[PDB]
Design a protein around this ligand. Structure first.
Ligand SMILES: O=C(O)CCC1=C(CC(=O)O)c2cc3[nH]c(cc4nc(cc5[nH]c(cc1n2)c(CC(=O)O)c5CCC(=O)O)C(CC(=O)O)=C4CCC(=O)O)c(CC(=O)O)c3CCC(=O)O
Lengths: 119, 119
């Protein structure tokens, strides 16, 4: 009844999409959401509008959109809200819930320290 | 004897730099590294060359550079290695060690799920 849509920047390179694809696989393995889709802001498919429609077509009435971005920027603040139609795509009486980016989470510091030590 | 340098993209907005600043502060509280510095690839100061010199000036002989990026891209594969001189003035008794980005870590999935639930 609710869907999770992970949105990413996109790249002319393949690494950004591979990340979102792997992230969606790992989330699916956790069996929390009925529907899970990814969309990429630029350069690649699925686009963000296509992911929201796939979710709607599978029968989701609440679409949770999580920006897989570390920090806020023009994408997360302007460009993406606009694609979702949240700022001046047909949301069919469904609710889109636009979540927060990753930010300076304690678990990021944990990751950073591992990377520093080659782990 | 060794320094940790966190490098980030930079932004015409203030959100990207604040993240790196909060991240540096959190790492410093862990007391693992003698010297901790941040550098921004574009738009903002400190720049990446400035951070490596600040580190050198305090007396670091090994400079661990961690890309605070989720995925590989042209910045992490070309532009940043270039600034580090890996592909300005680097003393010979000093080595730069360029680490990996965050990637599709389990701890990221954990973060994504919290964000999905508005936590
Ligand atoms: O003109 C060129 O192409 C050369 C420069 C260029 C390319 C690089 C290249 O292709 O050489 C580059 C590529 C990418 N940029 C990255 C990130 C973002 N760049 C920042 C700002 C924008 N940069 C744009 C252009 C450049 N975009 C524009 C114009 C536009 O996107 O519309 C602006 C927006 C300005 C506006 O519209 O007013 C922002 C926004 C912000 O931070 O606010 C961030 C995103 C958050 C962040 O990570 O900072 C990422 C993701 C990453 O790297 O993490 C990619 C893809 C991965 C990769 O690089 O493989």
């Amino acid at each position: 009844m609710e869907a999770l849509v992970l949105v990413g920047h996109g790249s002319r390179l393949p690494y950004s999409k591979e990340l979102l694809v792997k992230l969606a696989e790992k989330v699916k393995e956790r069996n929390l959401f009925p529907i899970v889709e990814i969309g990429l802001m630029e350069f690649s498919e699925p686009t963000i509008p296509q992911a929201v429609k796939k979710a709607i077509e599978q029968g989701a009435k609440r679409i949770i959109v999580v920006p897989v971005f570390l920090a806020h920027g023009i994408h997360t603040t302007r460009d993406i809200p606009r694609l979702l139609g949240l700022i001046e795509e047909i949301p069919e009486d469904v609710e889109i819930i636009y979540r927060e980016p990753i930010g300076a989470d304690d678990r990021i510091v944990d990751i950073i320290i591992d990377r520093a030590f080659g782990r």
